[PDB]
Amino acid sequence: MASLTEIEHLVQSVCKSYRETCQLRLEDLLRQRSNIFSREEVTGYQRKSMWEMWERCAHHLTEAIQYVVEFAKRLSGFMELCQNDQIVLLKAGAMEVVLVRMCRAYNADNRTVFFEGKYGGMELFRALGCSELISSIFDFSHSLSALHFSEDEIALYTALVLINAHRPGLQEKRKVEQLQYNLELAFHHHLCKTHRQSILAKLPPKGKLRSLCSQHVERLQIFQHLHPIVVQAAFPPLYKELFSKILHRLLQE
Numbered sequence: 001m002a003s004l005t006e007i008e009h010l011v012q013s014v015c016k017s018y019r020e021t022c023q024l025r026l027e028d029l030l031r032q033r034s035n036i037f038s039r040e041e042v043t044g045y046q047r048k049s050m051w052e053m054w055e056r057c058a059h060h061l062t063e064a065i066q067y068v069v070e071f072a073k074r075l076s077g078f079m080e081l082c083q084n085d086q087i088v089l090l091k092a093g094a095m096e097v098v099l100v101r102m103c104r105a106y107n108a109d110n111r112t113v114f115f116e117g118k119y120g121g122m123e124l125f126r127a128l129g130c131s132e133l134i135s136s137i138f139d140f141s142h143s144l145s146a147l148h149f150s151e152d153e154i155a156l157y158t159a160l161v162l163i164n165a166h167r168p169g170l171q172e173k174r175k176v177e178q179l180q181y182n183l184e185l186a187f188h189h190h191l192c193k194t195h196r197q198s199i200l201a202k203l204p205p206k207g208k209l210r211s212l213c214s215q216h217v218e219r220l221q222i223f224q225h226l227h228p229i230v231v232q233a234a235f236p237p238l239y240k241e242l243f244s245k246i247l248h249r250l251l252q253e
């Protein structure tokens, strides 16, 4: 199954689907690198309440995940899977895709991330009270920045993060397996053609993405236990569904 001309076509459709749903253009994020938060603006974030910061971050994550849902819907073969499998793959992989996509918004020169219009370091998130999770995210982006990914590499690698046949809950495991194998062939074909197979050994282990997602869910249970009405009243419904039937509605459209 699948010849070279079908694998090359798969490369281009994955790359196109990603460009159409990448949220912020790479050029836009790069042209903003000199726009950094002043020490007074950083102090303003540190002085914000923990629940306000948690609500702003959960809001930004939700928006980014909505683009990931759109990337999945445009991905060859994903809409062909059953709804249960689509939801299982999105519930487990949407946050993982966002964690990879996030390296485009990270400047490794000053160790800053693009957040709410300007670049800021780890210290911008001190009010969250989850320094271990923040450092883990920042280190993860630092590690991905050393790979010097092209937009096409991120498109192909994020399609594979999402189409994972080993996710618990899958009803048509073989159909996801076949789709995964085709995307793996297309990612490796593209790396071989561009003389970039050296990155395979340097890609993060699968347990690193699982550890980041786990730390997120753990820090959320801590925050929710202290502010259950804040999560209930001010957190996005899609966020609560994923981490605490929006997905079904987003997939129907």
Ligand SMILES: O=C(C1CCS(=O)(=O)CC1)N1CC[C@](c2ccc(OCc3ccccc3)cc2)(S(=O)(=O)c2ccc(F)cc2)C1
Residues within 6 Å of the ligand: 022, 023, 024, 025, 054, 056, 057, 058, 060, 061, 064, 098, 101, 102, 104, 105, 113, 114, 115, 125, 128, 130, 133, 134, 137, 138, 216
């Ligand atoms: O970077 C993006 C976007 C990706 C798509 S794009 O087009 O390149 C524009 C940028 N992000 C989308 C949202 C972001 C996000 C990342 C991780 C995350 O983890 C869960 C969490 C929740 C609450 C507290 C701590 C951690 C939540 C949101 S963010 O808010 O900017 C943020 C950033 C750093 C950080 F350390 C914490 C929050 C990253």
